[PDB]
Amino acid sequence: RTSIEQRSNAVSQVLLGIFSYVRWPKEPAVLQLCVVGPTEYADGLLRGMVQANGRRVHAERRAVDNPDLGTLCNVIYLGVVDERERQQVFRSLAGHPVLSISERGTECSVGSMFCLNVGGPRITFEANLDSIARSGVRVHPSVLKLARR
Amino acid sequence: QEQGFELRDEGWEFGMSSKVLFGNNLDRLNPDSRNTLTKIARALLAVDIDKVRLEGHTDNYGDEGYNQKLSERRAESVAAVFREAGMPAANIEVRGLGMSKPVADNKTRAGRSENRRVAIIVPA
């Protein structure tokens, strides 16, 4: 009932939504978004975005085994990776101030702060507050109203 | 849309001090953990969330079966606090994962300590 382009645009919108409830301890001039691992719904992200506060979002794909993901991005959009790959990615991110969002929402027990459910009439997400607490970034609770819109 | 840019200094309850950690072999919440939890519960109810999944965990010390049950007790202690804060009982799912999903390195005291936790998950 929804196309791939509709879903990708909806993913772009919900990510901008979520970013607006987030604060980094050192706010960059340009927000760095990294798309990591195989994705279906990231093509919109990768054209680049502008936040409502004026700040540009620069998007690139990076490799799962890049050891510096944690210093190269403010945000990671994580695709459909293996358990070994997922462990690799979060080991690299640990202790760095990074917002993590997964495309798929089957495994939100550990790792990503937000896990999207994109198939269906609207995008929803789960939020893992333990992952948020460990993230090094501030996330306001009212971000949770985006999942119900 | 992007209404979060309107937010000023009020209600930032999900920071570094909002992890829910436990002592070695303990399944009871200390006074400050109860406090954090009541505040998290209040924050969630303030944004119209009254449904939650609570996932308990252990470090990898000892028997796997014992640890599975300890992880359930930890999630149960958290559930009781959400109920006393006013969250409806039927809307709180409890789950124990035992030792199987660590967040931190089990080979250090500090890492094992980060693993003895309950993760509050907010579903769609």
Into how many domains does chain B fold?
1
Kind of pairing, strands A31-36 and A56-62?
Answer: parallel
Query: Counting runs of H as helices and runs of E as strands, what totals does chain A give?
Result: 5, 9
* Solved using: X-ray
Strand order in the sheet with A114-117: A49-50, A56-62, A31-36, A75-78, A99-102, A114-117, A124-128, B118-122, B52-56, B92-96
Contact (CB<8Å) A142/B15: no
Ranges of beta strands (E only) in B1-124 are 52-56, 92-96, 118-122
Quickly tell me which residue has 């252990």 as its tokens. B58
Closest CA to A148 of A5, A9, A6, A14: A14
Residue B5 CA to residue A135 CA, distance in Å, equals 20
Question: Domain limits at B75?
Answer: 1-124
Contact (CB<8Å) B47/A141: yes
Q: Are B37 and B21 in contact (CB under 8 A)?
A: no
We report the CATH number of the domain holding residue B75 as 3.30.1330.60
- Using CB atoms, which residue from A21, A129, A142 is nearest to B120? A129
Q: Are A29 and A74 in contact (CB under 8 A)?
A: no
Residue B122 CA to residue B20 CA, distance in Å, equals 15
Contacts of B48 in chain A (CB under 8 A): 145, 148
Residue A102 CA to residue A77 CA, distance in Å, equals 6
Residue B95 CA to residue B84 CA, distance in Å, equals 19
What phi and psi, each to the nearest 5 degrees, are found at residue A108?
A: -105, 15
- Using CB atoms, which residue from B4, B18, B114 is nearest to A129? B18
Whether A98 and chain B come into contact, CB under 8 Å, resolves to no
Which resolution in angstroms does this entry have?
2.2
Closest CA to B123 of B80, B101, B93: B93
Residue A12 CA to residue A5 CA, distance in Å, equals 11
CA distance B120 to chain A (A): 5
Contact (CB<8Å) A117/B103: no
Q: Which residues of A are annotated as a binding site for GMP?
A: 23, 138, 140
Closest CA to A111 of A92, A95, A87, A133: A87
Q: Are B10 and B16 in contact (CB under 8 A)?
A: no
Residue A35 CA to residue A41 CA, distance in Å, equals 10
Scanning every residue of chain A, which has its alpha carbon at the shortest distance from the alpha carbon of B95? Answer: A109
DSSP string, A91-118: HHHTTS--EEEES--S--SSS-SEEEE-
CA distance A112 to chain B (A): 11
